[PDB]
Amino acid sequence: KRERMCMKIENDCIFEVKHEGKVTGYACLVGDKVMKPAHVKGVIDNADLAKLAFKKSSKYDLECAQIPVHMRSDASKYTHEKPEGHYNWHHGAVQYSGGRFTIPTGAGKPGDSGRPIFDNKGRVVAIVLGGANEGSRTALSVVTWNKDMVTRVTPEGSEEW
Amino acid sequence: KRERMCMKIENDCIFEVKHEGKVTGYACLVGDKVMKPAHVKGVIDNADLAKLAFKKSSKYDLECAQIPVHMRSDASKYTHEKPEGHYNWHHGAVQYSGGRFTIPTGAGKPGDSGRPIFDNKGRVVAIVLGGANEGSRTALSVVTWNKDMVTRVTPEGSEEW
Amino acid sequence: KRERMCMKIENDCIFEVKHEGKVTGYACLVGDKVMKPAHVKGVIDNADLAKLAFKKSSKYDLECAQIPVHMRSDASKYTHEKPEGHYNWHHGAVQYSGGRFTIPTGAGKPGDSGRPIFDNKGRVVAIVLGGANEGSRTALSVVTWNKDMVTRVTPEGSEEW
C-alpha cells in the first residue's frame, strides 16, 4: 500500500541523469521547482527539463529551476514538518533520530544522489546528497527545507554519492 | 441532497448575460450586491439588475452594484474561510489544493464565466473568471475574499472564458 | 364548465402590457375596439396593436383604438344589461349590489388594471381600473358602458392599480 504508492510517486517524479552513457544522479520534481544536486554532473533524460536555465548555488550544493506548466500535475507535494520516527525511501525505510537521517541498512552506494526522502503521506521531506559511514549505520548528508528557508545538514566524514 | 440544494440556490442567485442573443456570462447575487465579471460584455436578463449603475475596477476585473430591496431575500450567503478539501460547482466538484482551484476534468468552456464556487453548507467561496490548461487539470483564475478585501488569483497562461 | 369558458375567452382577448420589461396592465378586445386604462403606461406585447393609433381621454381614464380586420374573430362580445347578482372574474367571483362592483376577498393587487369582468354568458360588461379598501370587501372602481354612454364609477378612497 504505502510502498506501492511511494514507488508510483517516485516513477512519476524522478528523471535519470546520465553522463557518458551511465547514470550518475537523479533530478526530482518537488512542488513547482526542478531540484537536482549540484555536485553531480550530467544531463537530464528529458527534452523539456534539459533546456531550462538552472540556478546555481555552491553553499547548498543544489540546482533549482522552474518547471513548465504541463508537468505541474506530475510533481510531488512538499512539506516542512519533520516529526521523529520513520520515513520511507527507495532502498528501504529511513530513521529520523536526534536531528539526523540514518540508513539502517548501510547499503548506500554512489549514484543514488538526489532521490527524495518520503513521508508517511507521500510528502517529500529532504533530498539525499551523501552519507557518512557510521560503522553499521550511515548518517545522511541531506538538504531539507524550513518554513521558508533551505538548510544543509552534513555529518562529519560524509562522502558525496 | 447537496447537489439539489446547490441547484436550488443557483437558480435563485444566477442571472444569465447575453450579447447578440448568445450567452456569454453570468451574474450572481452574493450578500447584498450584484457581482459580474468585468471582461464579459452584454446585459443581465432583468430590468432591475440591468438598470443599476455598476462600479468598475479593472485591477480586480469585476463590477459591483447594490441590489434593490426586494431581492434581498434571493441572494446567496458568503464566507471567507477556505478549508483544504472539495467544493461544489455547477459542473462537478472542484479541488482546492495549495492555494489553487483546479478542475479534475478540464471540462470548463468559454461562456461559463461568473459561475460561483460553493462551499459544503451552500456558502459561496469565490467567483470563476478564467482557467488555464495545466496538464490534464485546469487551474481556475478566481476572485476570492479575505475578511474585508478582494483578492484575485491568476495562474500563468490563464484564458478569460 | 363556466370557469373553462371564461379562461378560454380571457386567453383569446387579453394582451399583457409591459413597461421597462415588466408587465403592468392588460389590453382587452371587446367588440371591435382595443381598450387600455390611461394610468397604466407601456407597450402592448403585440406587433399589430403597437402601431395602431390610440385615442386618449383622461375624463374616463381609458384609451381606445380600432382593431385590425383579421383580429375581429379573436374578441369578446359586449352587453349593457347588468341585473343584480354575481359576475365572474379572473381572480374569482364578483358581486354586483346597489350599483357597485365589490371584491369578496380583497385580494386585488397592483397590476390587475385592465382585466375585464364577465357575464354568466361570457360577455364582457366592465373593465377594472382600481379598488377601494372598505373593511373586508373592496369596492371596484371600473369603467362600464351604458346603452350609449361610457360612465365611470369611482368610490371614495380608491387607489389606481
Angle at C11 between CA C7 and CA C13, to 5 degrees: 115
Experimental method used, please? cryo-EM
C-beta separation of A91 from A105 below 8 A? yes
d(C-alpha C127, C-alpha C33), whole Å: 13
DSSP alpha helix (H) spans, C52-106 = none
Q: How far apart are the first and last CA of chain C?
A: 30
Q: Which three cell numbers stand for residue A134?
A: 557510521
Which residue is listed with cell 365589490?
C102
Q: Which three cell numbers stand for residue B119?
A: 462551499
Does the active-site annotation cover C39? yes
C-beta separation of A82 from A95 below 8 A? no
C-beta separation of B135 from A74 below 8 A? yes
C-beta separation of A132 from A139 below 8 A? yes
d(C-alpha B15, C-alpha B19), whole Å: 13
Does the active-site annotation cover A97? no
d(C-alpha A107, C-alpha A94), whole Å: 12
Residue A9: left (phi > 0), alpha (psi -120 to 50), or beta? alpha
In 3-state terms, what secondary structure has residue C44? strand
From the CB coordinates, do chains A and C have 3 or more pairs under 8 Å?
A: no
Query: Which positions of B are catalytic?
Result: 39, 61, 113
Q: Residue B13 contacts by C-beta under 8 Å, 6 or more apart in sequence? A: B28, B29, B30, B74, B75, B76, B116
d(C-alpha A111, C-alpha A115), whole Å: 10
- DSSP string of C3-23, one letter each residue: HHHHHHHHHHSEEEEEETTEE
d(C-alpha B43, C-alpha B25), whole Å: 9
Q: Which three cell numbers stand for residue C68?
A: 385590425
Residue A64 exposure: Cα atoms within 13 Å on the Cβ side? 12
Q: Which three cell numbers stand for residue B22?
A: 448568445
- DSSP string of A118-141, one letter each residue: E-TTS-EEEEEEEEEEETTEEEEE
Give A57: exposed, middle or buried? Use CB within 10 Å, 0-12, 13-18, 19+: exposed
Find the Cα–Cα–Cα–Cα dihedral C3, C9, C15, C16, rounded to 10°.
0
- Residue A146 identity (one-letter amino acid): N
Residue C48 exposure: Cα atoms within 13 Å on the Cβ side? 11
d(C-alpha A64, C-alpha A55), whole Å: 5
In 3-state terms, what secondary structure has residue C45? coil
* B50 contacts on C by Cβ (under 8 Å): 21
* B135 contacts on A by Cβ (under 8 Å): 69-74
Angle at C52 between CA C48 and CA C56, to 5 degrees: 140
d(C-alpha B44, C-alpha B48), whole Å: 9
Does the active-site annotation cover C113? yes
Q: Which three cell numbers stand for residue A152?
A: 544543509
Record: contact B46-C22, CB cut-off 8 A: no
Whole-number CA gyration radius for chain B: 15
d(C-alpha C46, C-alpha C156), whole Å: 35
C-alpha dist (Å) from residue A124 to A88, B117, C51: 10, 31, 76
How close, in Å, is residue A34 to chain B by CA atoms?
16
Q: Determine phi and psi for B31, rounding to 5 degrees.
A: 65, -110
Record: contact C20-B46, CB cut-off 8 A: no
C-alpha dist (Å) from residue A118 to A30, A33, A44: 11, 17, 22
- Catalytic site residue from C76, C113, C141, C158: C113
d(C-alpha A86, C-alpha A29), whole Å: 22
In this complex, the chains that touch C, judged by 3 or more CB pairs closer than 8 A, are B
- Residue C113 identity (one-letter amino acid): S
C-beta separation of A115 from A147 below 8 A? no
d(C-alpha A49, C-alpha A17), whole Å: 11
Q: What is the DSSP letter of C76?
A: B
Q: Determine phi and psi for C70, rounding to 5 degrees.
A: -70, -15
Residues of A with CB under 8 A from a CB of B: 69-74, 77
Q: Which three cell numbers stand for residue C22?
A: 415588466
